Design a protein around this ligand. Structure first.
Ligand code: CA
Ligand code: CA
Ligand code: CA
Ligand code: CA
Ligand code: CA
Ligand code: CA
Ligand code: CA
Ligand code: CA
Lengths: 16, 16, 16, 16, 16, 16, 16, 16, 16, 16, 16, 16
């Protein structure tokens, strides 16, 4: 899976 | 329902 | 939403 | 709240 | 399943 | 437990 | 953690 | 992830 | 319900 | 328990 | 909180 | 997704 970091803005992404 | 956008501060609200 | 207070009897209600 | 009956098609709605 | 009604005392039971 | 297959109609049941 | 027994009144507390 | 649309028949699939 | 104890092997069962 | 306030930065902590 | 590691035997504990 | 079989040791993995 991808995890999207949300703070709103998207501040990151992980990769699954 | 109302959704309150929380960022902490409240940065929005939706209206249900 | 309405919240119904349950104790059984209903002992209250909130109002959403 | 509204409940939407989903079967896809929407086959109903309840009203809260 | 059995459902036990809890109020604490047990005030009921359902029968599954 | 019994599982009731819901599609609305009931289209099946499993038996627990 | 503390568990508070709620019946409404608070009827107990456990201590975690 | 793949999402399989279930209606029973499988009526779709999404791709993650 | 039956609870099956899983450790993999099945190491027990409870019976509901 | 301690609650850590996350905003990312840690912006607080509660104490349980 | 304490976390108890369960494997059945208890094989550990963390401490909160 | 990958599923990791945990028993502690990792005793397997599935792949999604
Ligand atoms: Ca996934
Ligand atoms: Ca609602
Ligand atoms: Ca922020
Ligand atoms: Ca059951
Ligand atoms: Ca259908
Ligand atoms: Ca009572
Ligand atoms: Ca084991
Ligand atoms: Ca806790």
């Amino acid at each position: 899976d991808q995890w999207l970091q949300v703070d709103a803005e998207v501040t990151g992404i992980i990769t699954a």
